[PDB]
Amino acid sequence: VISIMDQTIKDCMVSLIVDNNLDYDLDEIETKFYKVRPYNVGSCKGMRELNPNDIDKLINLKGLVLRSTPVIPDMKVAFFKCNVCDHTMAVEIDRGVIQEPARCERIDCNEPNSMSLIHNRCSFADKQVIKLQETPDFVPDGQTPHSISLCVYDELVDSCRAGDRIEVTGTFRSIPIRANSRQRVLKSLYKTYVDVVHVKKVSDKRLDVDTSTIEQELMQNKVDHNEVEEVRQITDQDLAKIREVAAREDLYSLLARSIAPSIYELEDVKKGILLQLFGGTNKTFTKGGRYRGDINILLCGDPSTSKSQILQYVHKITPRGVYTSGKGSSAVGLTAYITRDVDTKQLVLESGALVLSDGGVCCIDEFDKMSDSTRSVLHEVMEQQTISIAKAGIITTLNA
Amino acid sequence: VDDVTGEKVREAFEQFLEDFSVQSTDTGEVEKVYRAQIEFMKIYDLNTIYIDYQHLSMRENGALAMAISEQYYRFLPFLQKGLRRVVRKYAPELLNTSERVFQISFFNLPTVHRIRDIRSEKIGSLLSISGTVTRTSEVRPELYKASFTCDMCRAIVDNVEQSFKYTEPTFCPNPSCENRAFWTLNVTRSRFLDWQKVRIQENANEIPTGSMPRTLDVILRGDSVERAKPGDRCKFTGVEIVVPDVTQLGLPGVKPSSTLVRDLTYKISFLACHVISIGRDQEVFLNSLSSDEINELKEMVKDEHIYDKLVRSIAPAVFGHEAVKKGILLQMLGGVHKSTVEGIKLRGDINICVVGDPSTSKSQFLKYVVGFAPRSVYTSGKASSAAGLTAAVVRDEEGGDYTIEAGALMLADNGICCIDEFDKMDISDQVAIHEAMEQQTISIAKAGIHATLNARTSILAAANPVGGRYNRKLSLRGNLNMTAPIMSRFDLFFVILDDCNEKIDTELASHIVDLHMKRDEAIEPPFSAEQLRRYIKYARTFKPILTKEARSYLVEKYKELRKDDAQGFSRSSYRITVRQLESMIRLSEAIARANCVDEITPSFIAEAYDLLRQSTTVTYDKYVSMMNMIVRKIAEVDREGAEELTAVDIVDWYLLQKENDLGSLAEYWEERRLAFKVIKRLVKDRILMEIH
Amino acid sequence: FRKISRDRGIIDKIISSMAPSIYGHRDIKTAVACSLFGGVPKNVNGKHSIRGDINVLLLGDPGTAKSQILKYVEKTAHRAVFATGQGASAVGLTAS
Amino acid sequence: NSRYLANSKENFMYKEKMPDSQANLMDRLRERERRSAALLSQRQKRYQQFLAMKMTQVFDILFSLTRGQPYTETYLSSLIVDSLQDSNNPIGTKEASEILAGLQGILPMDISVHQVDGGLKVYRWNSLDKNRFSKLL
Amino acid sequence: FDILCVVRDLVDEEADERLATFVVDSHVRSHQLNARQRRLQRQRKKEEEISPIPQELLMKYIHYART
Numbered sequence A: 001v002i003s004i005m006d007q008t009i010k011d012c013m014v015s016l017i018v019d020n021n022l023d024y025d026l027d028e029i030e031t032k033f034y035k036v037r038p039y040n041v042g043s044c045k046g047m048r049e050l051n052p053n054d055i056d057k058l059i060n061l062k063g064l065v066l067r068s069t070p071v072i073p074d075m076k077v078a079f080f081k082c083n084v085c086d087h088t089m090a091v092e093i094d095r096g097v098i099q100e101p102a103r104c105e106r107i108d109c110n111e112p113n114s115m116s117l118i119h120n121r122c123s124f125a126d127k128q129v130i131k132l133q134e135t136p137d138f139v140p141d142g143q144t145p146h147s148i149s150l151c152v153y154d155e156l157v158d159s160c161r162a163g164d165r166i167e168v169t170g171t172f173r174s175i176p177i178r179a180n181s182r183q184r185v186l187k188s189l190y191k192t193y194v195d196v197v198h199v200k201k202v203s204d205k206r207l208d209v210d211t212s213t214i215e216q217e218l219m220q221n222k223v224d225h226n227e228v229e230e231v232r233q234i235t236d237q238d239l240a241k242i243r244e245v246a247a248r249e250d251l252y253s254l255l256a257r258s259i260a261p262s263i264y265e266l267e268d269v270k271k272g273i274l275l276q277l278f279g280g281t282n283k284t285f286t287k288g289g290r291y292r293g294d295i296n297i298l299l300c301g302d303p304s305t306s307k308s309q310i311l312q313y314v315h316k317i318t319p320r321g322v323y324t325s326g327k328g329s330s331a332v333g334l335t336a337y338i339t340r341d342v343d344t345k346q347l348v349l350e351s352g353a354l355v356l357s358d359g360g361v362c363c364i365d366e367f368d369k370m371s372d373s374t375r376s377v378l379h380e381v382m383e384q385q386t387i388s389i390a391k392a393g394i395i396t397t398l399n400a
Numbered sequence B: 001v002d003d004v005t006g007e008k009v010r011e012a013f014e015q016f017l018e019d020f021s022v023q024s025t026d027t028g029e030v031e032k033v034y035r036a037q038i039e040f041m042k043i044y045d046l047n048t049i050y051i052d053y054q055h056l057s058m059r060e061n062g063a064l065a066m067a068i069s070e071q072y073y074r075f076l077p078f079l080q081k082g083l084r085r086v087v088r089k090y091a092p093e094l095l096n097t098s099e100r101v102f103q104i105s106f107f108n109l110p111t112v113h114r115i116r117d118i119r120s121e122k123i124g125s126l127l128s129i130s131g132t133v134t135r136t137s138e139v140r141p142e143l144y145k146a147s148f149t150c151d152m153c154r155a156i157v158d159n160v161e162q163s164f165k166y167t168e169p170t171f172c173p174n175p176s177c178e179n180r181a182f183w184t185l186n187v188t189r190s191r192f193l194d195w196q197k198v199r200i201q202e203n204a205n206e207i208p209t210g211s212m213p214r215t216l217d218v219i220l221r222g223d224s225v226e227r228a229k230p231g232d233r234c235k236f237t238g239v240e241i242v243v244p245d246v247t248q249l250g251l252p253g254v255k256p257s258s259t260l261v262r263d264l265t266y267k268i269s270f271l272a273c274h275v276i277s278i279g280r281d282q283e284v285f286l287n288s289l290s291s292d293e294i295n296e297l298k299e300m301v302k303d304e305h306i307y308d309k310l311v312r313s314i315a316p317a318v319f320g321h322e323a324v325k326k327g328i329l330l331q332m333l334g335g336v337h338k339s340t341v342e343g344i345k346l347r348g349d350i351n352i353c354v355v356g357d358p359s360t361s362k363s364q365f366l367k368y369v370v371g372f373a374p375r376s377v378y379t380s381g382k383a384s385s386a387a388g389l390t391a392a393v394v395r396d397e398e399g400g401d402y403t404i405e406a407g408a409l410m411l412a413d414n415g416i417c418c419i420d421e422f423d424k425m426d427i428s429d430q431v432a433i434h435e436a437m438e439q440q441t442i443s444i445a446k447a448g449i450h451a452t453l454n455a456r457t458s459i460l461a462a463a464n465p466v467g468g469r470y471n472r473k474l475s476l477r478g479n480l481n482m483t484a485p486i487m488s489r490f491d492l493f494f495v496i497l498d499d500c501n502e503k504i505d506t507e508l509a510s511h512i513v514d515l516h517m518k519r520d521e522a523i524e525p526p527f528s529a530e531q532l533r534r535y536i537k538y539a540r541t542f543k544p545i546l547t548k549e550a551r552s553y554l555v556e557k558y559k560e561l562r563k564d565d566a567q568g569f570s571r572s573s574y575r576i577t578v579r580q581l582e583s584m585i586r587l588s589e590a591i592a593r594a595n596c597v598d599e600i601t602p603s604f605i606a607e608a609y610d611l612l613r614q615s616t617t618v619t620y621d622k623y624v625s626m627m628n629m630i631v632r633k634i635a636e637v638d639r640e641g642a643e644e645l646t647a648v649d650i651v652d653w654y655l656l657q658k659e660n661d662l663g664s665l666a667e668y669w670e671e672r673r674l675a676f677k678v679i680k681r682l683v684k685d686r687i688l689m690e691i692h
Numbered sequence C: 001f002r003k004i005s006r007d008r009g010i011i012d013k014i015i016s017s018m019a020p021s022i023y024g025h026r027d028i029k030t031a032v033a034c035s036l037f038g039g040v041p042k043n044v045n046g047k048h049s050i051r052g053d054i055n056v057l058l059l060g061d062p063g064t065a066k067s068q069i070l071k072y073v074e075k076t077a078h079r080a081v082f083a084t085g086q087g088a089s090a091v092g093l094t095a096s
Numbered sequence D: 001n002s003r004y005l006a007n008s009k010e011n012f013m014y015k016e017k018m019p020d021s022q023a024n025l026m027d028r029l030r031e032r033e034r035r036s037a038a039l040l041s042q043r044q045k046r047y048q049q050f051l052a053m054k055m056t057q058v059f060d061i062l063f064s065l066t067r068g069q070p071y072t073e074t075y076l077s078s079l080i081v082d083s084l085q086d087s088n089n090p091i092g093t094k095e096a097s098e099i100l101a102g103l104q105g106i107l108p109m110d111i112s113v114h115q116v117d118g119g120l121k122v123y124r125w126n127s128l129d130k131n132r133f134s135k136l137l
Numbered sequence E: 001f002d003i004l005c006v007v008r009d010l011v012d013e014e015a016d017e018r019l020a021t022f023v024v025d026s027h028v029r030s031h032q033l034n035a036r037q038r039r040l041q042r043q044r045k046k047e048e049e050i051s052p053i054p055q056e057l058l059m060k061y062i063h064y065a066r067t
């Protein structure tokens, strides 16, 4: 359906230009291909739902990315060595096979011939592998949120640096592996990835600077439709109910208790919590900047006074919460830790409890019982929302 | 047509370096320029020739240069071969060379690329890349063209390798046989050029703040080797070829094989031919800069109150702190670091180190500077470790040997390396800095490697006092919780307070609100945060002297800056040592570079001293300036035996003084009333005693 | 060379020229010169080989130009190996 | 002398004590505001000057290397800054935007810039000759 | 160790003044064929502002001695 879509796209381009006097002289247009970007096909249920029944379907996935393989080239058209025959030959592949003609060039000056390939002038294509760690929206317990490796092809490449909180819509895939890699024998239990098609950029509104090529034009085409696409649901019966609730006078009281109905008279706590949920607005300055758009609420008091349970309650309320205990956690747990991967010699980030909570609240218990060696990353993240790590391999600042 | 395409490239290029490429004569260099380059090259053993790219553009309206740039790697051998046809004519170096090798290296490209701009579309093309080196590799000889010897014919073959895999002929070109047995390699008749591989990473200026900087590995061949040095920013120039890496397996998967043979797995790697590493010289910097921008500087330097116009325009968001903002403006303008007599070399840089009570906007200065000072770095400190801060030792698989990681200090060279929360940094890492403070260079003897790398790096600090906020009750001695040396090496000190008031806190609150009221971004200071950069990049080059007898002055002054300190009983100062005197020298020099004036005059020393010493009513500075000027005036009238001085005579004396005050006559009427307020205030004060 | 070294002031002219840019500290400059020139070592198969090589420990104090002195020494002497106690890594100082 | 922009004398002292004029200073000041009109505008023309020289190289900055036709504004700007403008003569981002607008305006023949939702995308390069119009400073 | 260089910093009204004069003059003196002659000899004049033996003499001296 994507193929027939691109066909129709090019053809309607042609009809449009034979109706519209001048654009690309009817040919430069027709020469270049056309690709389509269908996004938001119905948000699938994250990882643990992905069925081997939908190996070839259009899945939608959310969740931040962990590591991005450096740009990897990929053969698309060969350029074979100009032999003593002195007429180099170029040819594409159109499959994982690459055929080198035994005979030499146009004249059979060497019918027996050792044709070689010039692997510098040959064209290429960008294939970026992007690991992905889905959001902990539903991960019950026991297992760390899962991971689905991704591949990206030549236009969405580098649209997703490390740490971002992207969303993707792409087709599932399934490929076998080898064990000995000497004999042609493969292994059952295919491995799986996602050949991406479209990437909702960051699901954020920083807009400091760009990352990639044309893709940003897609981002601009994306940001304007904000209302329905971001609310993911809106009806003026829902919106009418909303405005009606807003009209109600006991609102600030009501919604307070409406957070944790099971929680007793200590309402002001509820009030502060509610105000945390709506936290602030992102006032972005061209000079200065990073003014911690949200707030932060400690709460203390006599033991057995609902505090911990209020925390549970909130963490359940918000769609991004990351519960976490104190004294059973370390600075690395609080703020992701970087690793110079020696595989491809790159920067991977791992398991930021704080980074998982990028946007939306976190929770922390026994805050006092936290160690003094810990409870120091807070001194940074809470007031700048960045973590500046500087260890033997790498120095960087990951904003959380 | 591609054969004759490369041949037209040859013709055009031989023609370019044939005729003159430089029109100048009688003022610069002779008309023919690359002929002179060749002549210089012939006498010596340069073995390569650099040529401008602009001139290439100016050769055939860029078309030649455009063609060279877009597709390049196809022409490297083509142009290198075309070069001989020229050089054979004029300089007969090549037959006397017994070898036929010349790295035609380009430079001065018009469009640098951030490393994340690298695609595969740019394959085989020519490109320039800014970045920061790291973890150089030891130079290893690399084969370029080898002599293969037949197994039975034993004939010589000038076989060329392509950095891919062992190449080999197919039939013995000796027509005696057409064998396929493996021709025996020879190392002697085989010209091999050593190359060094360095891991370059993206700098900070181009990466969006908050994102991890991508990297890559680049290879230096030819004489370009050894030109790199861990930490040095560089702007490489060269090809963007791809190297086969059999080590890519698994996770990608689908990747194809050469079957109509084995999977050709690849990875990008820049290959740079020329390296540039830079970052009375005004003879250079000025005429290098075109006459137009000279007007812009001329303005921003001939204005009278620049030194003030600058200092109140370094922290547009921050409110006041005219002490610290000064301390920063002087930071970005280093000293001279000029070495002594061949005996030793002394430091020429400044290290301001704020220490402030809570909510003093001390992290704002940093997270600003590190975003405005070139080649800078921000590290929270306590998260980091001492080893990471100075230099790291790590192993590499290329030669199975230990080597260096640049770290924050070495990749922060010639830029401010700000830091947070010293106190939180346990001494285990506080120690690793000292050598990057006074000795200016780090020295490391680990895992067999002994080395020493110079880190000419300004530093900073923002640690908080011991008890978070520090008791005004307690003293300062048992209040900072840091040893004597690192307390001294900081050639500034700013214990910032935080206290209550009304005529202050109201202003501060209004200011913060106006900030959070985006619409009320009236924050525009006189000088933008950009023209300040160019003005600095100029002023960085003055290296003034103390020729003014301020020298004598300074000596005497230092005396009191020792006397005022009275630790115990004639016991040594906590805060001031002779290093502070050297610091006064540098602060003076830096203020001079600020005002863009050589030969520091005593008033400069005065400002440096008072800045170093710190730790109704109207705007306080204005009142005290009125006081100072008026008291000097009255003292002069005293000495000169002049008769008397009246209030209205003093007001007209200021009429004289501040005419660049400007504004409107209304202002004069207002400033006059202010002057009368001030003089009657002194009267009400006990500064000058009145008569009659 | 001898013509100079045959004077009477050499033992103090050297000191006053031992340090290019230092004020005072003649005593410390003296010890620097002494351990710089070195003494005649003498192997002792009888009891234990005793080296004739001085070993100065400079108990410094902030402000006093001690590191500048030893940097001068690094430059002037013949086999200087400057190494700071930050990157010590005992495996590094001694052989391994 | 050659434009070594030093000022070693102006910082001498409060030498400005000779002119013991009357309220005549108001006289000078009465003209001050007048020049404030020109001066400001003068400074303005300075950018009309300054930016000018910069663009004299920009039509060989994007030209001589970048033949991707759909180039946008943010990307091209962030390319201009951090290009050779990290050498002796820096420049700011929005200033690069001004440079682009000026290039387009002084050459609307090829360079066609039209904005969609945010950021003005720029045209498809066709490599004219330039200084022939650069003389229009 | 055999020798223990005990240095100490002590406030003095005068000795520090002279020392300061010295250090300031130090930072003052720091900063074709005939230009190189006029430069080498001026560096040697600065080598003589610290009146005793010039340096190169002294390093050749220490080499001679230890040999």
Ligand SMILES: Nc1ncnc2c1ncn2[C@@H]1O[C@H](COP(=O)(O)OP(=O)(O)OP(O)(O)=S)[C@@H](O)[C@H]1O
Residues within 6 Å of the ligand: A262, A263, A264, A265, A266, A301, A302, A303, A304, A305, A306, A307, A308, A309, A310
């Ligand atoms: N006002 C209240 N409303 C609702 N539940 C309450 C209230 N007071 C006590 N409880 C219950 O008492 C228990 C106290 O749990 P928590 O107060 O959350 O634990 P905790 O207070 O964090 O314990 P510590 O000592 O403070 S760590 C829970 O079962 C609560 O449901």
Ligand SMILES: Nc1ncnc2c1ncn2[C@@H]1O[C@H](COP(=O)(O)OP(=O)(O)OP(O)(O)=S)[C@@H](O)[C@H]1O
Residues within 6 Å of the ligand: A291, A379, A383, B317, B318, B319, B356, B357, B358, B359, B360, B361, B362, B363, B364, B463, B464, B508, B511, B512
């Ligand atoms: N003088 C000031 N004017 C305006 N805003 C200020 C000022 N001081 C602090 N602020 C604001 O208050 C916040 C706290 O600033 P700082 O005290 O610098 O934070 P900090 O750097 O984390 O301090 P520490 O010592 O590391 S906890 C900042 O986000 C500022 O925007």
Ligand SMILES: Nc1ncnc2c1ncn2[C@@H]1O[C@H](COP(=O)(O)OP(=O)(O)OP(O)(O)=S)[C@@H](O)[C@H]1O
Residues within 6 Å of the ligand: B346, B347, B434, B438, B439, B485, B486, B489, B578, B579, B582, C021, C022, C023, C024, C060, C061, C062, C063, C064, C065, C066, C067, C068, C069, E019, E023, E026
């Ligand atoms: N007589 C002197 N003449 C000139 N400079 C001197 C003199 N005595 C001390 N100094 C200063 O001392 C500085 C170097 O002193 P250092 O020996 O490095 O002190 P320090 O040992 O590094 O301090 P530490 O090690 O942090 S306790 C020089 O840069 C001078 O500024």
